[PDB]
Each structure stands twice: as C-alpha cells, then as structure tokens.
RNA sequence: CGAGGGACCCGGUGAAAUUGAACUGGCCGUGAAGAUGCGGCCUACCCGUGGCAGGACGAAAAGACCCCGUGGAGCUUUACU
RNA sequence: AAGCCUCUAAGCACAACCUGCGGGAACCCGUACCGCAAACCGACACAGGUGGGCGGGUGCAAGAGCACUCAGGCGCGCGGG
RNA sequence: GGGGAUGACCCCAGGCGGUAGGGGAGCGUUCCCGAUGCCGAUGAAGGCCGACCCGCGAGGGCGGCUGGAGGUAAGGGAAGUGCGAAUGCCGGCAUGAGUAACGAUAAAGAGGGUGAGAAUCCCUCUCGCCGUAAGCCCAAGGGUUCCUACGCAAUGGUCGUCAGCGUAGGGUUAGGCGGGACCUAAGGUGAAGCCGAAAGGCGUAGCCGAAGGGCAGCCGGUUAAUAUUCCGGCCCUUCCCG
RNA sequence: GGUGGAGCCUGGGAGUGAGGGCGCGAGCGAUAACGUCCGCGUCCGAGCGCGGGAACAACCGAGACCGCCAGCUAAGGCCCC
RNA sequence: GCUGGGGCUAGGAGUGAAAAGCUAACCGAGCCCGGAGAUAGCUGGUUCUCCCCGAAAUGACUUUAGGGUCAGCCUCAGGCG
RNA sequence: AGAUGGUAAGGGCCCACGGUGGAUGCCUCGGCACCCGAGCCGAUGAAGGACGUGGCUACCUGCGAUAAGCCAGGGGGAGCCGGUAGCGGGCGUGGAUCCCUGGAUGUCCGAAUGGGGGAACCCGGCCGGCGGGAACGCCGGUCACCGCGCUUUUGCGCGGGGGGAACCUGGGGAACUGAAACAUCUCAGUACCCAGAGGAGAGGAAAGAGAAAUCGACUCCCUGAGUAGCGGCGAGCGAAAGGGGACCAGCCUAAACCGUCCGGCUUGUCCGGGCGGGGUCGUGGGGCCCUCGGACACCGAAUCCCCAGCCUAGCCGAAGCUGUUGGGAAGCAGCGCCAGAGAGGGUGAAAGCCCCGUAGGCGAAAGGUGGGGGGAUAGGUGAGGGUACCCGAGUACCCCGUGGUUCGUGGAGCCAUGGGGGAAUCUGGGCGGACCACCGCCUAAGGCUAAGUACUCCGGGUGACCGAUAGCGCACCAGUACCGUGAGGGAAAGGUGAAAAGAACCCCGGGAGGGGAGUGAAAUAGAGCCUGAAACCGUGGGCUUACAAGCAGUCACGGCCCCGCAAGGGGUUGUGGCGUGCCUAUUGAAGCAUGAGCCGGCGACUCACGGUCGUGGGCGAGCUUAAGCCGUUGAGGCGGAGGCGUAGGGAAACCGAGUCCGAACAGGGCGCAAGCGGGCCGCACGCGGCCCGCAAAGUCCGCGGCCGUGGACCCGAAACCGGGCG
C-alpha cells in the first residue's frame, strides 16, 4: 500500500524548498555545564552532506 | 438431440460423396451418429465364417453409412430440392409449393 | 588333509548403488603444496578369464570431532520477567 | 448378576401355577477353504512372529529331552558338470 | 573532426583483452491490432538433411524426403519469453553385466502317460526328512483364494501342459455347535443431579459391554466341493393349545 | 607545456570492503617460512590469451578487434629433439 | 512369572523395577493439516547474441569482523571548458 | 640384405534403413478468472452413502421391491429400448423415445428419533390384516429429547437438533517472523475452535457528530490522508469530522390513567401479574381537568391480494448452381442471390447462400420469483392554561482492575464492565478529551427494520487464458488405484481412419506373431494405431586401426572412397606440430574441492499501491481525475469531492519577499530576484516588456533503472503455536 511517513524524521528534521535538510546540532541537551558561550551558543542548524539523498526518501509523501 | 432435416421415408439426394448425385430412399436415418445409409455406398466389409449365415467364405454384407450433412431432400415433382420451411397447422416440410 | 553349501564352466531368468566424457602405464620435478592426463626419460601388440585390494585423495551420509550463525531445542539457578 | 428353588405385596381365586396325556410352532447371523502358513502380519510363494487342544510306539531311571519309526504329509520351485 | 547535396554515404586522427558491474543495438517463442485480409492439397505447422544464399549474431530465406490442415506478414504491443548444471523434478534408456543371486546343505533317482514342446504336470517302483511335527482339530485373521471344465495374455526368482494365475459354472443347508431374542465384571454411554466461555466434563437408577455364568446332540454314511447342519438310528429342550 | 575513455559540478545505477605474489622502507617472528600486518609501485585477481624460464598467476618481454603459406624485433638461444 | 480376549491413560502430555527408554519400523518432547510461499546476514542455481567503458578486496564506524551505512574506485545522462 | 601394401577377433567416424522411446506440431468433451441471473436444504425425514434392480450386466449413470422406473399436464413429430457393444425379443401418427412441472413409491444407514448397536444390522411395545394362525413369521400406522400454547396431572398441536464451496456476527485465541538479539509492540484479534441465523450478515432512527449556533438513521466506495495522533517516540500501527456518490423507512413496547379476571389477605381499598384503550419524545414529550372542534376529509405499509415481467421446457426464422485437379471442393473459373442473419461449430479440405443456430420475433397447461406496478386493511391525524403524577434500577456517577477507538496508564476523555459504595424523573441527567463556570447538542440504562455492500456449490457469455509435465488433484470410470491403524497423502493414463470400410480367405507357426490377398488417399494410418525427434540398441556400405601414450581436439601434408562437365567440395586419419573438461566458490582449479550417467519436457529478477531519477508526448500559472452516473455490450462521454505547485520562515503564536535567532537597520541560517526563444527601438539606449522556444514552473499519462510494504529471483531447514487423529 501507500508508504508511511517516518514520524521520527518528521519530528527531527525539516526539509526546505531547495532540497536542503535542516537539523539541529548535538551535544547540547543532556549536560551543558563545562562549555563556553561559544559551545553553548553555536547550536545553529548544521547542514548534512550527501546523506539528504538518503534522508528525503523518508520525508516522502508530504515532504 | 439435433433432430434431422429429412424424415424417414422421403426421397433424398446426395451432393458431396465419391459419386456425385443419385436418387435414393432413406433407410435408415440414424440421428445418433447423424448419418443416413440411404442406398448408395455398398461396402466390401469382412465377415468371419463362425455363424454361418452364408456357409461358404463370404466377404460382403449389409451396408456403410454416409454423413447427413451431404444429402438434401427433394420435393417430389420439382427439381428445386434445396430449402426447408415448416408451420402450416402441422410441422410439415413445404418449399416452392411442392408437397412433403 | 578331507567332506558339504558357494566360488569356477554350461543351460534358464537376471537386478543393484556408482557413473563428465575417457583411447585411463611407471619414475623424477612442477602445478592450491600427494598427477593416468602438465614437462623430461623409460616401459608397453589388441582384447579378455580367475584372484589380491595398493591407487583413482574409490562408494555410502551436504563431518557424527572443532569453529561460526546476534540458528533452534533439552536441562539448571540466589540470570530477567 | 441371570436361569433355577422357596415366601409374599397389588392383583386374581370360572383366574393363575405344577405334573402327565395328544397336536402344533422353534426365529436372525456364522458355516467353503488356509489357519503355526505360499491364503494371517511382515512391499515378496520372506530361514521372522501367531492363542487353545490331541499330539503314538520302542530304548536311554523318568519325561512334551534325545535317536528311529506308525497314521499323516514333505523333498523345501532353478539345475547339470 | 570533415566533404557538412544532413550523406542516415564516403575521407582524417585516435581506440577496440577483460570478471562483478554501468550503458547501447539486435534475434527467436505464446497471444493480440493489422485479420470479415493473405498463404495453403499444384501441400500449412512440425520432423530429417543441405557441401546453397544473407547476416560479426541470436538466426532468417531457398532446395529435397516425410507429414496431413493449419500458419500469418510489413509496422507495433503485452510476457507464464530463450536452460546444461541447483546431491533439481518428471518420463525413457544406458554403465555396472550377461555379473551377483535364484531364498535354510531334508535328497533325489528311474520307467510309463498327457502334450508341439517335460529334470519341474499325472501314475508306478526305490531313497531321504518331520513325526511335542514340516501331522490333525478350532478361535483369531484373510474374504472365494474351495471344486470342476477350458487355456498360458501377464505372475510363479528357470521351464511348466501345472498352479492357491485368467474365463465360466457350482459349492457354506443348524430348535440341540458358537453368538442375539438371557445376565454381568473392568470399561463406555447415560433418566435425576453437579460443574464449566461454547464445544463439553463428572455422574445415581438403568442400558451396553466376554475365550465369564446358564442353556437342549452323540455315532456312521453321502459329494469333485457341505456336515455335531443333508440322510439312518437314537435321546432331549423352549413356548402355545385341548 | 600537456585536447586526453584528461579533469571539475549535479543526478541515476550497481559491485567491492577474505586478497595474494614480487622489489624496497619496516614491525612481530628466530635478519625462519609460498608466515602475519602497513606504506611506496607493479602484476594476478579481472590478461590460466602469447613467447621465454622443461613444465608453473604474479621472474622477463608483451597489453590478443578479425583475416593472410608476408617482414622486422623485445626477453631468451644458435650440436640434435 | 508368561500369554489370549474386552478396556483406560497421550504430546510439554501419557507411561516408565528410571535409559530421558517407549508412544505404530527414527522420540532431549510423535504424527496429519493449517498459520506457512515462517525465517535463514547460510549453501547451490539463475537460461539468446553483438558492441563500448570498466572495478575493488581500501579508509571512517557498528553484542560486530563470512554481513553492513557513508567515503574511495567504475559506468550512464546533463552542464564547465 | 631392404621395404610399402596388408589380417580385422573386435572397435571408432560418416552415410542409409529399422526397433524401443513419446517430446514437438495441430484439435477439445476440460477446468482457470471476470461478468451478471440466482442463492439455503431438512422430522411431511436433509447433505451424503450401503445394498439391489436390465432376459443375459463387470462397472458408471438414472432409480428404489411400483426399482435404467409409474400416473397427469405442456413442449416435441418419427425414431426408439442410457454409456454400449453382442445374442435373443417386442413399441410407435390411435403421437413412441427425449425435455420440464406437479404427484405416488422410495429397502437400510445417516440430525436418526421405539430400544440396543461395532453405520448400511439385531430386538421390541400398542392397534388392524395375512399365512391352517393361539404359539412362528411378515406387512401398514404410532412409540427419542428440548422450548412453547391449550389441556388443573393424562395428552394434542407449533418449532428446534444436522449439513452447506465462500461470506458475516459474537465468545476464546496463539507462535515463527519485524524490531537485523529480545520481554512491552508488530504479525493480530489474523489462522484456528464453538454457537446461531442468512440469501447476505452485522449495524441502525442519536443520552450522535464536533465549532458552525452547523449536519441530521444506518451500510459501502473514492477522497480527506499515510493527515491528526499512538508507539522500548524504535520497529511500526493508524483514524475521525466534512464532501462527491450507491441506496433512502422508519417504527413497536413498559411507566404515569383506565376496564375484566386471578393471587396474598387485614377480603379492606390497596398491594403483585397477564390481557384491552392510552405513548414513543428534546422544539421536551406524555397522564388527568377546562377551552378552541370539525373530519364523517387526507396519508399509508416493511402486512395481505392481484397482475406486468423473469426462471424451470422450446419454436419460427432470408439467400446456389455448373465445370476442372483430386479419393474427397467448400479451393479455383463463370453467372448469380440474401442480409435486422458475412459470430461460431461440423460438413472426406479452406462455405454467408449443405446443416445446427446467430439478426429479429413468438412460447406456459403446471410450478417457483414477483425488489417492478395497481388495490385493501392494520396504523397515524391538532392548539393554549392548571397540576409536577411518569419518561426504561443495583442503572447513571465515583474508585480499582480491563478491552475497543490511532490512545500501550500518559494530562486520559467516550463506549461496554469483574468487584465495592450508590440517587434523582425535567428546577432530573449525559456529552462537547483531567477539571471549574458559561454557552451549545442529545435523552441512555427495552426491542425490530428492508435497499445499497461481501462470496460463488451451481447456470450461461466472454478472455493479448491454457492446450495433456499446461490447466483444478482428476479433459480418461479420480480424490480412484496405491501408501499409512488412523487423521491424512496421492498419482500416471487424450488422439487409427472421411466412413471400422477393425484385415474374409491361403500358408508357416501349439498359440502368439506375421508373410501374401483384399478394404483403404495412405496399412512404417493396424487396434492404447496422427505427426513421430534425441538418448539407447542393431543391420548393410566407404575409410582407418594388432609398435604406440590420450580431458580425445585444432592446423598442415598425403593416401583411400563418394559427388560435380570441370574448377572445387564432402567422410576418414598415417605422421608432424600445438594443447591442464564446464560451472560455482575462491588470493588462486585440469584439479586427488563440490554438482553433472545420457536425452526430452517443466523453472528461477514479475505484479498491486506509491516515492525518486531519466525519457516520449499534452497543457501551462495551471495541470488533473478517483468513486459513481448515462450508452452498443469489445464505443465513449458526464462526473472539480479531491491531490501537486504557484512564498516561505518560525516549535508555535505570528509575520511575510521577508522570517527566525536578538534590544537592534550589527551579524548569520532559510528563500528571494539574477534570463534562457529573445521582430522587443515603445522611437528617452533606465527601453517599459514583445513576434515568441511550450520554458524558467509545474502537473497527467506512457516506458525504463532503483526502492518500501506485500512471500517479492528461486529452491532448502533445526524449530514454534492452534485443532485433531493414534
Ligand atoms: Mg501533502
Ligand atoms: Mg465435384
Ligand atoms: Mg541353498
Ligand atoms: Mg550362467
Ligand atoms: Mg608428482
Ligand atoms: Mg593430453
Ligand atoms: Mg606424462
Ligand atoms: Mg573381495
Ligand atoms: Mg444378587
Ligand atoms: Mg471347516
Ligand atoms: Mg474340507
Ligand atoms: Mg499350535
Ligand atoms: Mg505373505
Ligand atoms: Mg519359495
Ligand atoms: Mg514364512
Ligand atoms: Mg506361541
Ligand atoms: Mg541296551
Ligand atoms: Mg519307556
Ligand atoms: Mg525332538
Ligand atoms: Mg507313510
Ligand atoms: Mg524332488
Ligand atoms: Mg524343485
Ligand atoms: Mg528353492
Ligand atoms: Mg578509408
Ligand atoms: Mg594508427
Ligand atoms: Mg571489449
Ligand atoms: Mg558483466
Ligand atoms: Mg500455446
Ligand atoms: Mg490459394
Ligand atoms: Mg508433397
Ligand atoms: Mg504454433
Ligand atoms: Mg510416414
Ligand atoms: Mg518462465
Ligand atoms: Mg536436461
Ligand atoms: Mg547421481
Ligand atoms: Mg531420474
Ligand atoms: Mg561368463
Ligand atoms: Mg562371478
Ligand atoms: Mg566382475
Ligand atoms: Mg552364482
Ligand atoms: Mg541345494
Ligand atoms: Mg524322473
Ligand atoms: Mg522320462
Ligand atoms: Mg513315451
Ligand atoms: Mg527328479
Ligand atoms: Mg473368520
Ligand atoms: Mg491380502
Ligand atoms: Mg480369485
Ligand atoms: Mg485343468
Ligand atoms: Mg505361462
Ligand atoms: Mg515363467
Ligand atoms: Mg496345449
Ligand atoms: Mg485351487
Ligand atoms: Mg480358479
Ligand atoms: Mg441383549
Ligand atoms: Mg424371538
Ligand atoms: Mg445386559
Ligand atoms: Mg439386570
Ligand atoms: Mg458399572
Ligand atoms: Mg460407566
Ligand atoms: Mg460422559
Ligand atoms: Mg457369553
Ligand atoms: Mg459360556
Ligand atoms: Mg436329524
Ligand atoms: Mg578512466
Ligand atoms: Mg569486512
Ligand atoms: Mg579486510
Ligand atoms: Mg593487506
Ligand atoms: Mg601472504
Ligand atoms: Mg616472506
Ligand atoms: Mg591487469
Ligand atoms: Mg593452467
Ligand atoms: Mg613457458
Ligand atoms: Mg599470465
Ligand atoms: Mg589491443
Ligand atoms: Mg631478423
Ligand atoms: Mg508381549
Ligand atoms: Mg501441538
Ligand atoms: Mg509436564
Ligand atoms: Mg507420570
Ligand atoms: Mg520408535
Ligand atoms: Mg523429535
Ligand atoms: Mg517453507
Ligand atoms: Mg506469519
Ligand atoms: Mg543485512
Ligand atoms: Mg578496456
Ligand atoms: Mg558506496
Ligand atoms: Mg558529458
Ligand atoms: Mg566379426
Ligand atoms: Mg527412417
Ligand atoms: Mg529412428
Ligand atoms: Mg508405444
Ligand atoms: Mg414435529
Ligand atoms: Mg438422498
Ligand atoms: Mg449403483
Ligand atoms: Mg397435450
Ligand atoms: Mg402436438
Ligand atoms: Mg442403442
Ligand atoms: Mg442383434
Ligand atoms: Mg436387438
Ligand atoms: Mg411393431
Ligand atoms: Mg405426450
Ligand atoms: Mg410411456
Ligand atoms: Mg418428478
Ligand atoms: Mg416404507
Ligand atoms: Mg435407530
Ligand atoms: Mg445413537
Ligand atoms: Mg389386536
Ligand atoms: Mg386373521
Ligand atoms: Mg385365521
Ligand atoms: Mg421443522
Ligand atoms: Mg472473516
Ligand atoms: Mg472476538
Ligand atoms: Mg512474539
Ligand atoms: Mg526479530
Ligand atoms: Mg492492531
Ligand atoms: Mg443450524
Ligand atoms: Mg450451523
Ligand atoms: Mg442481496
Ligand atoms: Mg443488509
Ligand atoms: Mg440484522
Ligand atoms: Mg439488528
Ligand atoms: Mg430514540
Ligand atoms: Mg464520510
Ligand atoms: Mg453528499
Ligand atoms: Mg399494554
Ligand atoms: Mg396503542
Ligand atoms: Mg401470490
Ligand atoms: Mg431452423
Ligand atoms: Mg436457415
Ligand atoms: Mg459443388
Ligand atoms: Mg463455416
Ligand atoms: Mg463460392
Ligand atoms: Mg435469440
Ligand atoms: Mg410465494
Ligand atoms: Mg425494485
Ligand atoms: Mg415527577
Ligand atoms: Mg487506555
Ligand atoms: Mg462507561
Ligand atoms: Mg459494575
Ligand atoms: Mg459521565
Ligand atoms: Mg467532560
Ligand atoms: Mg431508543
Ligand atoms: Mg462456474
Ligand atoms: Mg495433469
Ligand atoms: Mg503431445
Ligand atoms: Mg488400506
Ligand atoms: Mg485401391
Ligand atoms: Mg500392414
Ligand atoms: Mg499386408
Ligand atoms: Mg513403431
Ligand atoms: Mg499397442
Ligand atoms: Mg488428423
Ligand atoms: Mg505413430
Ligand atoms: Mg557393423
Ligand atoms: Mg620398438
Ligand atoms: Mg601397425
Ligand atoms: Mg594430435
Ligand atoms: Mg550454467
Ligand atoms: Mg572473485
Ligand atoms: Mg572433478
Ligand atoms: Mg579426476
Ligand atoms: Mg564447499
Ligand atoms: Mg557425484
Ligand atoms: Mg536574513
Ligand atoms: Mg545571507
Ligand atoms: Mg526565476
Ligand atoms: Mg517508476
């Protein structure tokens, strides 16, 4: 039957108009104590390289 | 359970045999194999001495049938013979007002 | 050493697993490292009958020992539920 | 437990039961053959297994053991060198 | 890259080993549009050949023999579409090979007869084996295998005229023998009753349930095949009637 | 300089992730292994197509589009097979 | 003690003078059907032809080393030149 | 001293002819899938069988001691006594055989049902009959259980038991697999077990839905939408509202009040129950009393009656001859004919005009259906005020433990409840997702309901469906032979010829088997007989082998033989030279690693729904249909519910060519406009934007690669669970 949208992907990443995949940076949620204002602050929606051709495949029917 | 296009009795004419056309009297009709045995094809069929109905050594007996799709019934005064019609108060066979 | 039932010959019926095709020699070397088939030398007319089983890594069973599989079961306990 | 022997309840004692004398009726299934093998069970005319009874005589002390033989069967369903 | 008659035809330069792979171009089979058509007894599909023709090919034409009634362009499409391997499957035929075996080492020999054909079938004379059986009588079990007549298509571990093999015709006779119309044990079913989602499971009385109890038959003859049943003698039992 | 099945970007599509030999630079080993694991390159794998090394994948030459009863050469040889 | 006849006990169960034996010729949990065309990163097989290019056995990670995701190597198409 | 020819017990290669062998080619009496019509049977004895019946009968089929059958009616009109032969018999225009409907009989078993029973057997009771009939036997009725109404107990009538290919509902209910282990989850409430009913079932007239003061029973399809949501937030599972459609039907009953009878009895003035009037509601309805009154007019079945029509048998139904090859004309040649019929099949071969039927039109005595259409009846019909008597009791509601909806305990609603507590009757309650107030919707704790939807034992028509290793397991005398105690497993086996015209007769031979002769177009078309391949086994001819060593071959020279007028070609190897079978798995195979005895046949990368990319088209800021409706039954249109994109950011609010991070126009991430075909010279070189490439710009369809869910390239487990057989 019709394929199902991966709800983990739909809740974690956000695909833009021109094919790019926008997701947050890691190493921030659990422990944030011994980090500078740079390491706390620079969580700025990193981009994913050569994996979005295997990441927009499960953001498929509604994109 | 196909019926026939000829009766018992009524004079019939062959069309597509080894011989092409001679007048005969249909005996008998036999609609199981759908084949008339009218008067035409005598056969040389073998027969064992055992019985004996012919007490020397004979080699010919009763007949051989012809397929009923070849033959056609004549109306008795016409020369017309090909067609069939029915249904005038009794199921007869009348074409080109020739009788049955 | 002797006797009987087989083995051997003849008359009759007459299978079986195996089987790539084979016109299938020995030695010394090479080749996946144990050669009838590759190279060199030597021997050998063709085809059989009875026997031995040394070879064809002969046959049987997709190792029965060992290892792997996030294989499956039997059993144990203060391993979990 | 039943047949049979005996005593009684309801009932019946013109009935009912017992012994004789004469006359009738007695129904449904099995019934052959093999049954310790060629016919049963073993894919087979298979050296295997299959319950009960009669299962002789003579001699070995006795005996269903052993040896032979009555009645009964059999030469084993491939033979000849 | 060029002559660019755009030539989808010829020149120039370079290249053309290849697995797993990536890509391009074709052949063959079933069916369908073309097909209310065309080819086909002067011979269709299929089978056996060709040293013939074309194509780098899967192949396609043409010629000959057999065959007896179907096949189908060109241009396209849909695939149950191409086999040598899977200790693949199914059917046939080989090797093993005229080889092992032919089934308890109880044992055969001979003369006649039938018959086309006899070590094997029938009769006769010897020899051997079992004889607490390799003999006889029943219950299991098997289901006509029993007998006669006619035969060897197939079977009998050989042959076979024989057969427990085939065809046809007969053959099993019961008040007293073994079972039911008698009874009961283990066990099963099961009025009442009890329990469980349903199917159902226990279960008194009663019923079924046997090589258990009771019940009236012994001897001999008869057929090729039936016998305590048919027959001869003889004795009994159950029930009913007067 | 270098027009080459050279490169660069995007998209589609696989396969591979057991390697091995040889020379050098090394480790472990024993300065042993056709032993194990790296790097620099080649070859086999995928060139078991060819010639030589007798035979042999990696030692040498050479990179097989097809055909010819034509020559010249690479490695290796010129006594005969 | 042996045995005939009629029965009862059964699959995570029965039975067992206890071997994990036997339960219809194979029992560390039978047989038949269905789920079920279960799963298998584990073997084997995978069928017409021609042409062009052409690999890898490497790196980074995984209750993982015989399998994987990405990168490296290859091919096709479209652009840069 | 020498040497070539030569011998073939036998072999090898090639050629020709045979046998075994049954593939290929061609046909169907066959089943497969779709479409509709239709869809329960049965104590008045089902589905299915055992046994028996034919003058002779092995089997299949039809029947049941009335036994390949009997009676009545309709069709049918001349051949019959089934497949099915053979001997022997009789029937039919005075309407035989055959088909359909209604009847009768219908042994025995089987729900089995008098009882027992190991199914196809045995034994009975009561009432009548028969045999001489008391004892013995037979025949014809009745005798099982359960739930109801009457019958005060007795008994009499009405139903149920069992089966049915698939479907449906309710009660139980798994495991392997997926998460690359795996216990919550998925598989899945699926397979499977039980119960009842049906031609469907279930559900159904709101204590609904959910935001609009909106819709208005229920079922099914497409959308919404793989959206919201749930989930070790992993695997994965997955709506609902609304809309476009198919269909459209709504009702009955308890309660309050009233009449009769019965029960307890204080026979009082009330209680308990069955009947008759009275009520089916959210706009609140309804009981009693008063007023408006008039219905005596209308609606109307889902009930009943009749009928159109359909089914179980059928019928009519146009149009051709001659000559030739041949055994056969339908081919071919000439002249024609019909068409509301030129679909198909058979006809010795290839036919519109030879036959059966297709086009079209008629056909019911009798029995089913009659959802379609006309009639009848039951049943419904109204407004204001007063009274607050009634509106579905261990029930709503609360707590704990549960299932379903996407809801897995999370903030956890709603629908049913296993247990505990526990009321009210419109100023009473439930819902709008913990909960409170407001505002909206509806009346639960009783029941029924057609139509639209699923499936095919069976009937027929169709098929880019098949053609005996295919197709269902069986085209054939198949769920048979055979295996297994049993549950169960499970085959192979089609073809002579136009017509058996099936080979009379002679001879050999015991027979079988043939050789002749004859029929036959053909007899290698001979009776399991069309075509008849290969492996395999032989016979006859050419070449070569008894001094040569090889995965058996290739090249060269020569000899021998055979074709061709010749040139040349074909079969063989005596010698020389060169040479490690195929595939897999591998760093690596001729491998003493695996598979293969040979031949013929079967077989392995598709398909549904979707995503991405490329390609051929259509249209373009638009593209585009699904479900369904209307048409001949091989013809298309209608049908904008819906989907993608045109504007995107942000978690959302919200904003927008900008958004967010942030106090901010710092700064950054997302998009944005950047110009392709470009006569655009409108005459201002800012050129605004134009003939204009179907494109930046996207959609629909086709064709390919790949992917996900489905078994997904095929084969193969050790095992697990459910139901049963032993
Ligand atoms: Mg969307
Ligand atoms: Mg003629
Ligand atoms: Mg012996
Ligand atoms: Mg011999
Ligand atoms: Mg060696
Ligand atoms: Mg060699
Ligand atoms: Mg050698
Ligand atoms: Mg030996
Ligand atoms: Mg007593
Ligand atoms: Mg006897
Ligand atoms: Mg006797
Ligand atoms: Mg005995
Ligand atoms: Mg036996
Ligand atoms: Mg014997
Ligand atoms: Mg024996
Ligand atoms: Mg004994
Ligand atoms: Mg003495
Ligand atoms: Mg003595
Ligand atoms: Mg003794
Ligand atoms: Mg004697
Ligand atoms: Mg003897
Ligand atoms: Mg003998
Ligand atoms: Mg013997
Ligand atoms: Mg040139
Ligand atoms: Mg050049
Ligand atoms: Mg190439
Ligand atoms: Mg390749
Ligand atoms: Mg076909
Ligand atoms: Mg013609
Ligand atoms: Mg010819
Ligand atoms: Mg064909
Ligand atoms: Mg012929
Ligand atoms: Mg195929
Ligand atoms: Mg083969
Ligand atoms: Mg083999
Ligand atoms: Mg075989
Ligand atoms: Mg010999
Ligand atoms: Mg020998
Ligand atoms: Mg030997
Ligand atoms: Mg011997
Ligand atoms: Mg002997
Ligand atoms: Mg003698
Ligand atoms: Mg003699
Ligand atoms: Mg004599
Ligand atoms: Mg003798
Ligand atoms: Mg018996
Ligand atoms: Mg028997
Ligand atoms: Mg017999
Ligand atoms: Mg005799
Ligand atoms: Mg014989
Ligand atoms: Mg014999
Ligand atoms: Mg004789
Ligand atoms: Mg006999
Ligand atoms: Mg006999
Ligand atoms: Mg009794
Ligand atoms: Mg009696
Ligand atoms: Mg009793
Ligand atoms: Mg008693
Ligand atoms: Mg008892
Ligand atoms: Mg009992
Ligand atoms: Mg019981
Ligand atoms: Mg007894
Ligand atoms: Mg007794
Ligand atoms: Mg007597
Ligand atoms: Mg390159
Ligand atoms: Mg690895
Ligand atoms: Mg590695
Ligand atoms: Mg390495
Ligand atoms: Mg190494
Ligand atoms: Mg080394
Ligand atoms: Mg290379
Ligand atoms: Mg080699
Ligand atoms: Mg060399
Ligand atoms: Mg090499
Ligand atoms: Mg080259
Ligand atoms: Mg030179
Ligand atoms: Mg015993
Ligand atoms: Mg089980
Ligand atoms: Mg246990
Ligand atoms: Mg126990
Ligand atoms: Mg056992
Ligand atoms: Mg086991
Ligand atoms: Mg399986
Ligand atoms: Mg499953
Ligand atoms: Mg994997
Ligand atoms: Mg290349
Ligand atoms: Mg990669
Ligand atoms: Mg390019
Ligand atoms: Mg000779
Ligand atoms: Mg021939
Ligand atoms: Mg032949
Ligand atoms: Mg044959
Ligand atoms: Mg009744
Ligand atoms: Mg019946
Ligand atoms: Mg019958
Ligand atoms: Mg009449
Ligand atoms: Mg009439
Ligand atoms: Mg007849
Ligand atoms: Mg006759
Ligand atoms: Mg007759
Ligand atoms: Mg007459
Ligand atoms: Mg009549
Ligand atoms: Mg009659
Ligand atoms: Mg009738
Ligand atoms: Mg009767
Ligand atoms: Mg009964
Ligand atoms: Mg019973
Ligand atoms: Mg009486
Ligand atoms: Mg009387
Ligand atoms: Mg009387
Ligand atoms: Mg009834
Ligand atoms: Mg269902
Ligand atoms: Mg349920
Ligand atoms: Mg599980
Ligand atoms: Mg798993
Ligand atoms: Mg679920
Ligand atoms: Mg029922
Ligand atoms: Mg039922
Ligand atoms: Mg319906
Ligand atoms: Mg319905
Ligand atoms: Mg209903
Ligand atoms: Mg209902
Ligand atoms: Mg209501
Ligand atoms: Mg809706
Ligand atoms: Mg609507
Ligand atoms: Mg009432
Ligand atoms: Mg009323
Ligand atoms: Mg009526
Ligand atoms: Mg007609
Ligand atoms: Mg006509
Ligand atoms: Mg003519
Ligand atoms: Mg025709
Ligand atoms: Mg004509
Ligand atoms: Mg019609
Ligand atoms: Mg009716
Ligand atoms: Mg209607
Ligand atoms: Mg009130
Ligand atoms: Mg919950
Ligand atoms: Mg609730
Ligand atoms: Mg409760
Ligand atoms: Mg509530
Ligand atoms: Mg609420
Ligand atoms: Mg209601
Ligand atoms: Mg059908
Ligand atoms: Mg078949
Ligand atoms: Mg065939
Ligand atoms: Mg049996
Ligand atoms: Mg002639
Ligand atoms: Mg002949
Ligand atoms: Mg002849
Ligand atoms: Mg033949
Ligand atoms: Mg034959
Ligand atoms: Mg034919
Ligand atoms: Mg033939
Ligand atoms: Mg010869
Ligand atoms: Mg010499
Ligand atoms: Mg020589
Ligand atoms: Mg050579
Ligand atoms: Mg292959
Ligand atoms: Mg490899
Ligand atoms: Mg090998
Ligand atoms: Mg070898
Ligand atoms: Mg291996
Ligand atoms: Mg082998
Ligand atoms: Mg910005
Ligand atoms: Mg920026
Ligand atoms: Mg733009
Ligand atoms: Mg696609």
Curated annotation (Swiss-Prot), chain A:
For whether the record's keyword set contains Ribonucleoprotein, the answer is yes
Which Gene Ontology CC terms are recorded? cytosolic large ribosomal subunit
Q: Which UniProt keywords apply?
A: Ribonucleoprotein, Ribosomal protein
Gene Ontology terms: biological process: translation
Source taxon at top rank: Bacteria
Quick check: keyword GTP-binding in the entry?
no
What GO MF annotations does this protein's record show?
structural constituent of ribosome
In terms of InterPro entries, this protein maps to:
Ribosomal_bL35, Ribosomal_bL35-like, Ribosomal_bL35_CS, Ribosomal_bL35_sf
Q: How does it assemble?
A: Part of the 50S ribosomal subunit.
Read off the NCBIfam families from this record: rpmI_bact (TIGR00001)
User: Its family?
Assistant: Belongs to the bacterial ribosomal protein bL35 family.
Stated name of the protein: Large ribosomal subunit protein bL35
Q: Which organism is it from?
A: Thermus thermophilus (strain ATCC 27634 / DSM 579 / HB8)
UniProtKB/Swiss-Prot annotation, chain B:
Q: Where does the sequence pass through the membrane?
A: none
Superkingdom in the source lineage: Bacteria
According to the UniProt entry, its GO molecular function terms are: rRNA binding; structural constituent of ribosome
Gene3D superfamilies to which the protein is assigned, alphabetical: 2.30.30.30
Key words of the record: Ribonucleoprotein, Ribosomal protein, RNA-binding, rRNA-binding
Chain segments annotated as coiled-coil in the UniProt record: none
Keyword rRNA-binding listed? The answer is: yes
Example GO BP: translation
Q: Would you tell me the Gene Ontology cellular component terms?
A: ribonucleoprotein complex; ribosome
Function, as annotated: One of two assembly initiator proteins, it binds directly to the 5'-end of the 23S rRNA, where it nucleates assembly of the 50S subunit. One of the proteins that surrounds the polypeptide exit tunnel on the outside of the subunit.
NCBIfam families attached here? Answer: rplX_bact
What family is it from?
Belongs to the universal ribosomal protein uL24 family.
Q: How does it assemble?
A: Part of the 50S ribosomal subunit.
Q: State the name under which the record lists this protein.
A: Large ribosomal subunit protein uL24
Q: Which organism is it from?
A: Thermus thermophilus (strain ATCC 27634 / DSM 579 / HB8)
Quote the gene name from the UniProt entry.
Answer: rplX
């Amino acid at each position: 039957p019709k394929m199902k949208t991966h709800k983990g992907a739909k809740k974690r990443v956000k695909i833009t108009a021109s094919g790019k995949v926008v997701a947050m940076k890691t190493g921030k949620r659990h422990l944030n104590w011994q980090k500078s204002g740079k390491e706390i602050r620079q969580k700025g929606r990193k981009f994913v390289l050569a994996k979005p051709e295997a990441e927009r495949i499960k953001l498929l029917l509604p994109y | 359970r196909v019926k026939m296009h000829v009766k018992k009795g009524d004079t019939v004419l062959v069309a597509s045999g080894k011989y092409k056309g001679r007048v005969g009297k249909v005996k008998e009709v036999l609609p199981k194999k759908y084949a008339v045995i009218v008067e035409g094809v005598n056969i040389v069929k073998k027969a064992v001495r055992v019985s004996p109905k012919y007490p020397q050594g004979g080699f010919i007996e009763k007949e051989a049938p012809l397929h009923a799709s070849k033959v056609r019934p004549i109306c008795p005064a016409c020369g017309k013979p090909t067609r069939v019609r029915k249904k005038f108060l009794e199921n007869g066979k009348k074409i080109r007002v020739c009788a049955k």
